[PDB]
Enzyme design. Structure first.
Site, PDB file in Angstrom:
ATOM      1  N   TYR A  24      -2.279  -2.051   6.661  1.00 16.86           N
ATOM      2  CA  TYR A  24      -4.064  -1.624   7.393  1.00 16.86           C
ATOM      3  C   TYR A  24      -5.724  -1.842   7.232  1.00 16.86           C
ATOM      4  O   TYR A  24      -6.128  -1.773   7.405  1.00 16.86           O
ATOM      5  CB  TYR A  24      -3.966  -0.524   6.906  1.00 16.86           C
ATOM      6  CG  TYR A  24      -3.430   0.187   6.535  1.00 16.86           C
ATOM      7  CD1 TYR A  24      -2.119   0.554   6.838  1.00 16.86           C
ATOM      8  CD2 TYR A  24      -3.998   1.142   5.146  1.00 16.86           C
ATOM      9  CE1 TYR A  24      -0.714   1.005   5.557  1.00 16.86           C
ATOM     10  CE2 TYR A  24      -2.729   1.173   4.383  1.00 16.86           C
ATOM     11  CZ  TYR A  24      -1.964   1.574   4.460  1.00 16.86           C
ATOM     12  OH  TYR A  24      -0.537   2.235   3.416  1.00 16.86           O
ATOM     13  N   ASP A  25      -5.583  -3.212   6.047  1.00 15.81           N
ATOM     14  CA  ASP A  25      -6.106  -4.152   5.455  1.00 15.81           C
ATOM     15  C   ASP A  25      -6.528  -5.425   6.665  1.00 15.81           C
ATOM     16  O   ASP A  25      -5.980  -5.784   6.888  1.00 15.81           O
ATOM     17  CB  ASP A  25      -5.706  -4.428   4.096  1.00 15.81           C
ATOM     18  CG  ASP A  25      -4.701  -5.392   4.045  1.00 15.81           C
ATOM     19  OD1 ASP A  25      -4.401  -6.654   5.205  1.00 15.81           O
ATOM     20  OD2 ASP A  25      -3.282  -4.943   3.346  1.00 15.81           O
ATOM     21  N   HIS A  28       0.245  -0.062  12.912  1.00 19.43           N
ATOM     22  CA  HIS A  28      -0.162   0.828  11.599  1.00 19.43           C
ATOM     23  C   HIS A  28      -1.548   1.088  12.088  1.00 19.43           C
ATOM     24  O   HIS A  28      -2.480   1.762  11.541  1.00 19.43           O
ATOM     25  CB  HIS A  28       0.702   0.868  10.785  1.00 19.43           C
ATOM     26  CG  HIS A  28       1.752   0.931  10.667  1.00 19.43           C
ATOM     27  ND1 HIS A  28       2.558   1.726  11.734  1.00 19.43           N
ATOM     28  CD2 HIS A  28       3.117   0.874   9.754  1.00 19.43           C
ATOM     29  CE1 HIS A  28       3.628   1.285  11.561  1.00 19.43           C
ATOM     30  NE2 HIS A  28       3.957   1.381  10.530  1.00 19.43           N
TER      31      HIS A  28
END
EC number: 3.2.2.5
Lengths: 629, 116, 632
Positions: free
Chosen positions: C116-117, C153
């Protein structure tokens, strides 16, 4: 493909079967009454549309074409070689990302490829219409290609230069590893690929294949010349005004070379064909001069001079050409008088620098300008590119349209004195690839003045002693420029004792007149050769025919060399021993003197007639044509 | 003989070869060649007759011909391929009947002259 | 690394192969796990769990505890507290590790990640790659590019909120319900591409879920995904077979190199760097391999009757220069020289028997092709090279009756129709040629593409002839000639109205586009570009030689022009391409011959005329063109 947009700005209906919008648009443009019928939004859109079409030179339809004016105007500092101005533009803080794109092209144009690569990487970061992003990706890959090519070139070749640090070289390799310029357009947003389909060709390896194949018509022997020229200008304007680095690659430079040359040769063919039937075409402008200067190599210009007659081609915008020539010559002073040489910018600029001044023969230059070009060419041109021998030819070519005045003569005199100054060292020796040395420059001044005396050279000559021998024999090649006191001072250092010193004296210009003593010295050598019978002998024969020797005791040695008796007494010479090969070794003066002798003339005219018929030699044909020998 | 080019403006041969020659004074020179310069519009003096000026280079440096330059070829080596080519040079030297038959490179000053 | 490749297991090199071919084909997708992100010192989830645990119980883990404690914290502390810890932990700047650069250097079609970065995002912008980043449901429909950066995600672009990301339990439970399009997109990408898992543990939850869905697929309907294992210890043999049967093709970094327990970056790099350097490498070692690689490049060309030698540099991707005299020169082949090895087998008969039974006949097919095309050996093995010029075409030799009879015969194959259509064009029955070419297209993929090119070319010829006949044919002939009825003109206009010659090559299966890259130049006049540039260059060179009066003893400079002239004639005629009637091609032939005769006349007074030379001037020169030569 709904319309053809011709190079002269005329639109032609091509393939659309619906409503004719281009025809309707031009009707709206010509008359303003229907313009007010549009909505306010469509009114401002039409104004933006009208601005685009007049800026791009699309004026009207084919059937409404009238007095068409197709003048090339490239709004780019890079094309004009405004090196100082782009430096100032780079120095200033850039307001927008569009200015960054212009900066990076200017940095690339100025040889600062590392900075442009960094700038192009910066623009790509901040630009994700997305058109500048795509153009920067094209240009960053192009400059990476240029950097890689330059590294290979520099490793192969006058001194070892390392313009790019190995850390930078390793970095760009890791950024550009397995980088595909082919996938770039396909990976763009689908809106971009629809709106900017015309920008896809920049990602291809070759983009001028269409323009090069259409060049074949210029070789037809049966307008088109305007079509090729305007297509060339279209390619130049797009590549420069949009600041695309592909304009500096070999494909584009060769294309300009092919298109410019074939346009020139075609016009040359039209002139000769016209004179054959009409019995007594291409007009260059400032842009054509820049195109030839920037893209042609010295060999490529040489192929132009031999094939056609550019002296029959008239040059326009000569003040703009002069401004280009004074503008470029300024940069040489900046590059070499100071320590501002950019080794990367060096390689591209010197070739344009050499070509511009070589091509500056055909342009009329003002005195103040001519001083700047001459002083920059004579002094500030590095010897590795333009050595002593080649530099005079560049200087001597400027005299075709500009007869050497006093001020330019002073500059050459400054060059000659400086050349004498470097001769204080015994090791210093002029290296010329043309067999041409500092003596030739002095001959040029004596040709244009016939009375010029070099004061500073006279001071150097009078100061001379027997020690610094390298200076003494150097100024003996400059005897006509020296004063009488300097001439008398210098002559004391050489002797004419034996025959060899006479030939050395005749070769260096030590003496130009034959006192009776050298005739005896001339005579003594020949009797030894006659006694020893059972190089120079041919040389002596010419001088007797050239009326250099009036001893009249030359006929005793008739019978050894076929060239000797051929010159001493043409009337009694047997011409079955004649070899046509001699006339190829004879200069303008000697051949003309043979032509007017009224003896030997019908024999050599027969030998030349036989040779051309048997061998079809151009040198023999031109030797026979010009002087009728 | 694949690099061998015959120029017809001056009846000489261009060949990438060096010369080992001896003059009439027993002086020896090794790895020497010649360059010819066709300059028909040269600003001649009252005593200049030859249309071509030739410079002799040995060891990469030009020679000042202060004495008579009558000479004979003792060994000519083709630079690209070290095969001895002396027999061809002497055979070519007899045919052309011109001074300095084989020359490293010919420079044409005619096309660059403003009077061209 | 080159040493490491030398004793690499045969399975790993095969695994390296398929990954590399997929990367070239543009169908490689990387599934990037948290392990790659951890290399960049991104906050690992276990410390987020630790912080949530500390704020829950006050004192600081099974697989579900990673999902349950955040869910417990979210339930009892709320959304604000959950996102408050999320923000003060994940709102950091971290540099992209070199593995992110090495992933992009593989040129992946898509990048699927569970991270999720934005580390891949900023890595993509630094590299310059454009990816349509998709991390929510709406991004799937609003995707602006074909290439997808799929964050299955989610991420924190909208904000550092728990809803934007799949972190806790009840996000993995309801994943298929809240991410139907993203899950569908990920499954579709995996089905249609080749997947390399990197940064994932073999026991990772996502890997099991993907393997669970994979078992639902029928046998061999999917490509087995590739897994890069970077655990410090070598993978156990029993565990390896288990996951291979589950559907994974595992590449084990610990088995490849010896590395420290905590030195993960060297473990990731050893596989990434081996992948990166295998892109240029051909995996070419033994003679049987050499014949196999050359056969793969050349075998598609067997459909064509003749190949231009200058075009062969495109077949091998600029590895060599294929000279028109038949000599091969190393150009950009930094690996093993397969062309030198191929000719070494050709000259040495004993080494031919060393080849296997398959590679012996493949070499034989290569030998006939290379001998027929006039490719002999390398430049350093060049001897006296003299090749007679011959064109096996009835259209070139003017055997009009023979071609007429050839049309009357019944076709025995699809190439029979293709030759018939070209002969019909050369006999002026362009109507019969067009509908024939239409029939070849229906029944046809080398012949398909060439027929489409020729049909468009003959369509242009008909349209030009119709415009001439309508505009000037009545005045020229004294009668308004009507060779084509309006029904024919309307019908060919209707079919070819939307046909574009420029996209014909791009609108082909990728296998055609890679096996037949040299055929793309036939869409435009690009196929004449190299010879036109060369002809212009030598023309200036030759004319400069004649201007200065120089004569060269040995090879004649125009032999390059002479060979390229017949390279195009042999290629265009024997392949039955309507480009022989091109005005531009006629100008190219006329200019090449005109230079040849001028040089011959220059050399004569110091080349001779054959049957083929007579035909070229007869067909391609106008009367004024011949008169110009006769004057000079």
């Amino acid at each position: 493909y709904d319309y053809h947009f011709e190079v002269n700005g005329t639109v032609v209906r091509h393939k659309n079967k619906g409503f004719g919008y281009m025809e309707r648009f031009f009707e709206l443009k010509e008359s303003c009454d229907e313009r007010s019928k549009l909505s306010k939004k469509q009114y401002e859109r039409f104004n933006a549309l009208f601005n685009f079409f007049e800026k791009n030179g699309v004026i009207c339809m084919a059937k409404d074409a009238g007095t068409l004016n197709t003048s090339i105007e490239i709004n780019s500092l890079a094309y004009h070689g405004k090196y100082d101005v782009m430096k100032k533009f780079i120095e200033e803080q850039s307001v927008s990302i569009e200015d960054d794109y212009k900066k990076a092209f200017f940095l690339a144009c100025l040889g600062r490829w590392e900075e442009s690569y960094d700038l192009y990487s910066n623009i790509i970061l901040n630009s994700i219409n997305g058109c500048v992003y795509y153009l920067s990706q094209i240009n960053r890959y192009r400059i990476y290609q240029s950097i890689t090519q330059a590294v290979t070139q520099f490793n192969g070749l006058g001194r070892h230069y390392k313009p790019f640090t190995d850390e930078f070289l390793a970095r760009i390799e890791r950024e550009m590893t397995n980088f595909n310029i082919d996938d770039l357009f396909n990976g763009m947003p689908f809106e971009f690929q629809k709106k900017y389909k015309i920008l896809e060709f920049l990602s291809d390896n070759q983009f001028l294949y269409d323009d090069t194949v259409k060049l074949f018509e210029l070789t037809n022997k049966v307008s088109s010349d305007i079509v090729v020229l305007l297509r060339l200008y279209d390619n130049l304007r797009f590549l420069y005004e949009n600041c695309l680095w592909s304009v500096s690659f070999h494909e584009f430079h060769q294309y300009i070379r092919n298109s410019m040359s074939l346009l020139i040769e075609k016009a040359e063919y039209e002139r000769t064909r016209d004179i054959d039937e009409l019995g007594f075409g291409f007009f260059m402008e400032y842009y054509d001069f820049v195109n030839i200067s920037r893209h042609f190599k010295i060999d490529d210009i040489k192929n132009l001079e031999r094939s056609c007659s550019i002296d029959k081609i008239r040059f326009g915008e000569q003040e703009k050409i002069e401004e280009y020539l004074v503008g470029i010559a300024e940069e040489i002073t900046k590059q070499f008088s100071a320590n501002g040489m950019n080794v990367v910018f060096y390689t591209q600029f010197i070739s344009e620098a050499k070509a511009a001044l070589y091509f500056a023969k055909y342009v009329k230059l003002s005195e103040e300008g001519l001083g700047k070009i001459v002083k920059a060419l004579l002094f500030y041109f590095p010897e590795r590119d333009l050595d002593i021998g080649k530099r005079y030819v560049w200087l001597e070519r400027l005299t075709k349209c500009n007869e050497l005045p006093k001020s330019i003569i002073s500059i050459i005199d400054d060059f000659l004195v400086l050349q004498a100054e470097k001769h204080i060292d015994q090791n210093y020796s002029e290296v010329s690839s043309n067999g041409l040395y500092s003596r030739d420059y002095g001959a040029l001044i004596k040709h244009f003045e016939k009375n010029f005396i070099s004061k500073r050279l006279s001071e150097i000559t009078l100061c001379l002693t027997q020690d610094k021998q390298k200076q003494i024999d150097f100024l003996f090649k400059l005897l006509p420029l020296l004063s009488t006191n300097a001439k008398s001072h210098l002559l004391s250092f050489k002797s004419v004792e034996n025959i060899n010193d006479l030939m050395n004296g005749i070769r260096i210009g030590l003496i130009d007149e034959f006192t009776p003593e050298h005739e005896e010295l001339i005579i003594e050598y020949l009797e030894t050769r006659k006694v020893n019978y059972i190089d120079y002998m041919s040389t002596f024969g010419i001088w007797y025919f050239l009326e250099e020797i009036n001893n009249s005791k030359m006929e005793e040695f008739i019978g050894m060399d076929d060239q000797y008796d051929f010159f001493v007494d043409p009337e009694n010479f047997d011409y079955k021993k004649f070899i046509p090969s001699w006339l190829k070794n004879y200069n303008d003066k000697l051949l003309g003197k043979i032509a007017g002798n009224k003896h030997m003339k019908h024999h050599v005219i027969e030998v030349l007639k036989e040779r051309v018929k048997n061998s079809n030699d151009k040198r023999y044909l031109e030797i026979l044509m010009n002087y009728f020998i | 003989t694949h690099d061998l080019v015959y120029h017809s403006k001056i009846n000489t041969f261009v060949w990438d070869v060096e010369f080992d020659i001896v003059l009439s004074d027993s002086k020896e020179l090794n790895k020497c060649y010649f360059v010819k310069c066709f300059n028909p519009y040269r600003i001649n003096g009252k005593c200049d007759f030859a249309v071509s000026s030739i410079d002799i280079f040995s060891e990469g440096k030009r020679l000042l011909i202060e004495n008579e330059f009558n000479f004979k070829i003792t060994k000519a080596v083709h630079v690209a391929t070290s095969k001895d080519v002396t027999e061809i040079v002497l055979h070519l030297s007899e045919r052309i009947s011109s001074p300095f038959p084989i020359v490293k490179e010919v420079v044409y000053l005619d096309w660059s002259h403003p009077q061209f | 690394l080159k040493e490491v490749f030398l004793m690499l297991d045969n399975n790993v090199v095969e695994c390296i192969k398929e990954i590399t071919e997929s990367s070239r084909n543009g169908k490689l997708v990387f599934f990037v796990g948290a392990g790659v992100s951890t290399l960049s010192d991104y906050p690992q989830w276990w410390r987020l769990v630790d912080k949530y645990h500390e704020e829950l119980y006050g004192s600081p883990y099974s697989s579900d505890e990673y999902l349950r404690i955040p869910q417990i914290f979210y339930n009892v502390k709320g959304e604000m507290a959950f996102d408050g810890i999320l923000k003060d932990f994940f709102q950091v700047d971290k540099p992209t590790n070199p593995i992110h650069d090495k992933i992009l250097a593989m040129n992946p079609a898509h990048v699927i990640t569970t991270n999720y970065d934005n580390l891949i995002d900023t890595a993509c912008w630094k590299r310059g790659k454009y990816f349509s980043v998709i991390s929510a449901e709406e991004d799937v429909a609003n995707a602006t590019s074909s290439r997808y950066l799929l964050k299955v995600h989610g991420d924190f672009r909208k904000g550092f909120k728990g809803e934007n990301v799949v972190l806790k339990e009840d996000d993995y439970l309801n994943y298929d319900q809240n991410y139907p399009l993203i899950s569908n997109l990920m499954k579709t990408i995996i089905a249609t591409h080749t997947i390399v898992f990197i940064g994932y543990g073999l026991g990772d939850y996502n890997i099991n879920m993907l393997l669970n869905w994979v078992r639902k697929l029928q046998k061999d309907s999917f490509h087995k995904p590739f897994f890069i294992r970077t655990d410090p210890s070598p993978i156990e043999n029993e565990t390896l077979i288990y996951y291979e049967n589950k559907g994974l093709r595992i590449i084990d970094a610990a088995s490849l190199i010896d590395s420290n327990e905590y030195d993960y970056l060297e473990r990731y790099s050893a596989v990434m760097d081996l992948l990166i350097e295998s892109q240029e490498n051909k995996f070419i070692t033994k003679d049987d391999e050499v014949i196999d690689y050359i056969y793969g490049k050349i075998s598609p060309l067997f459909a064509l009757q003749y190949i231009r030698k200058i075009d062969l540099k495109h077949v091998f991707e600029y590895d060599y220069h294929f000279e028109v005299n038949g000599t091969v020169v190393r150009h950009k082949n930094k690996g093993f020289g397969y062309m030198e090895r191929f000719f070494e087998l050709k000259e040495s008969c004993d080494e031919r028997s060393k080849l296997s039974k398959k590679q012996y006949e493949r070499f034989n097919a290569l030998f006939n092709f290379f001998e027929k095309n006039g490719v002999i050996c390398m430049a350093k093995d060049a001897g006296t090279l003299n090749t007679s010029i011959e064109i096996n075409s009835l259209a070139y030799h003017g055997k009009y009756d023979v071609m007429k009879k050839f049309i009357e015969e019944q076709s025995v194959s699809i190439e029979d129709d293709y030759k018939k259509a070209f002969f019909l064009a050369c006999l002026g029955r362009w109507e019969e040629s067009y509908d024939l070419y239409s029939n070849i297209i229906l029944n046809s993929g080398c012949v398909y593409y060439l027929s489409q090119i020729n049909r468009y070319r003959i369509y242009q010829s008909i349209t030009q002839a119709v415009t001439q006949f309508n505009g000037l044919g009545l005045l020229t002939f004294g009668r308004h000639y009507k060779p084509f009825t309006d029904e024919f003109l309307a019908r060919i206009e209707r079919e070819m109205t939307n046909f574009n010659i420029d996209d014909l090559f791009n609108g082909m299966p990728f296998e055609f586009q890679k096996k037949y890259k040299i055929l793309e130049f036939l869409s435009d006049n690009q196929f004449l570009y190299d010879d036109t540039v060369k002809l212009f260059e030598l023309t200036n060179k030759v004319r400069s030689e004649m201007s200065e009066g120089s004569y060269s003893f040995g090879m004649s400079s125009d032999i390059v022009v002479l060979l390229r002239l017949y390279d195009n004639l042999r290629f265009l005629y024997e392949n039955c391409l309507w480009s022989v009637s091109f005005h531009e091609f006629h100008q190219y032939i006329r200019n090449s011959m005109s230079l040849l005769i001028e040089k011959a006349e220059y050399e004569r007074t110091r080349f001779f005329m054959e049957y083929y030379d007579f035909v070229n001037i007869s067909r391609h020169f106008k009367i004024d063109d011949i008169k110009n030569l006769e004057r000079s």
